[PDB]
Structure 1
Amino acid sequence: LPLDELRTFAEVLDRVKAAYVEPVDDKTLLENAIKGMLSNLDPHSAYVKSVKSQVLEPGYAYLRITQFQVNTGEEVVKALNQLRKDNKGRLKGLVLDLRNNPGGVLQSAVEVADAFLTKGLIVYTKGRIANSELRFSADPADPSDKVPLVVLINGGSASAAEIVAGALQDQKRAILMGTDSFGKGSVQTVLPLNNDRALKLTTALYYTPNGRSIQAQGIVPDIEVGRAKVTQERERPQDSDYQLSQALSLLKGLSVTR
Structure 2
Amino acid sequence: HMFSRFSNVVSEIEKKYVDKISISEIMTKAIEGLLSNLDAHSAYLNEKKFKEFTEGERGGLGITVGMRDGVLTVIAPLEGTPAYKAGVKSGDNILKINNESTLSMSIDDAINLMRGKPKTPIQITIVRKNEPKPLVFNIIRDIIKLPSVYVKKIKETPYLYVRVSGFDKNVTKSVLEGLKANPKAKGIVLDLRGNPGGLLNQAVGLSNLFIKEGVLVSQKGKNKEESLEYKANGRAPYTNLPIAVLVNGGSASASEIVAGALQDHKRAVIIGEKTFGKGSVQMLLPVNKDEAIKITTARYYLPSGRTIQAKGITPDIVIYPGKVPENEVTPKMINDDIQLKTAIDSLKTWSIVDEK
Q: What TM-score, normalized to structure 1?
A: 0.90
Alpha-carbon distance in structure 1 between the residues aligned to 2:213 and 2:224: 27
Secondary structure of residue in 1 paired with 2:229: strand
Partner of 2:98: none
Cα offset for 1:156? 0.6
Alpha-carbon distance in structure 2 between the residues aligned to 1:218 and 1:159: 9
Alpha-carbon distance in structure 2 between the residues aligned to 1:19 and 1:62: 66
Q: Percent identity?
A: 44
User: For each residue in 1:55-76, what CA deviation from the matched residue of structure 2 results, as whole angstroms up to 9, or x when unmatched?
Assistant: 1124110111110011111111
Match of 2:285 among 178, 187, 191: 191
Alpha-carbon distance in structure 2 between the residues aligned to 1:214 and 1:231: 34
Alpha-carbon distance in structure 1 between the residues aligned to 2:162 and 2:175: 8
Match of 2:349 among 239, 250, 253: 253
Alpha-carbon distance in structure 2 between the residues aligned to 1:113 and 1:253: 23
Q: How many pairs were matched up? A: 250
* Distance 1:197-1:131 versus aligned 2 partners, 3 A rule: farther
CA RMSD of aligned residues (A): 1.9
Higher relative CO (CA 8 A, sep ≥ 6), structure 1 or 2? 1
Secondary structure of residue in 2 paired with 1:214: coil
Alpha-carbon distance in structure 1 between the residues aligned to 2:153 and 2:39: 43
Match of 1:92 among 175, 186, 207: 186
Match of 2:163 among 26, 49, 64: 64
Match of 1:76 among 172, 175, 200: 175
> Is residue 231 of structure 2 the alignment partner of residue 137 of structure 1?
yes
Match of 2:35 among 34, 38, 44: 38
Alpha-carbon distance in structure 2 between the residues aligned to 1:254 and 1:234: 30
Match of 1:10 among 4, 7, 10: 7
Alpha-carbon distance in structure 1 between the residues aligned to 2:349 and 2:154: 16
- Mapping of residues 90-169 of structure 1, within 5 Å: 91-129=185-223, 131-169=225-263
* Distance 1:83-1:241 versus aligned 2 partners, 3 A rule: farther
Alpha-carbon distance in structure 2 between the residues aligned to 1:83 and 1:39: 50
Structure 1: give runs of 5+ residues left out of the alignment. Answer: none
Contact 1:81–1:143 (CA under 8 A) maintained in structure 2 = no
Structure 2: give runs of 5+ residues left out of the alignment. Answer: 45-145
The one-letter code matched in structure 2 to 1:70 is K
Secondary structure of residue in 2 paired with 1:73: helix
User: After the TM superposition, which of the residue ranges 178-187 and 54-63 deviates more from structure 2?
Assistant: 54-63
Cα offset for 1:225? 1.1
Q: What TM-score, normalized to structure 2?
A: 0.66
Alpha-carbon distance in structure 2 between the residues aligned to 1:194 and 1:246: 53
The one-letter code matched in structure 2 to 1:43 is A
Contact 2:212–2:239 (CA under 8 A) maintained in structure 1 = no
Partner of 2:100: none
Q: Which has the higher helix share?
A: 1
Alpha-carbon distance in structure 2 between the residues aligned to 1:67 and 1:59: 26
Alpha-carbon distance in structure 2 between the residues aligned to 1:243 and 1:231: 13
User: For each residue in 1:68-98, what CA deviation from the matched residue of structure 2 results, as whole angstroms up to 9, or x when unmatched?
Assistant: 01111111111111233xxxx2x22111111
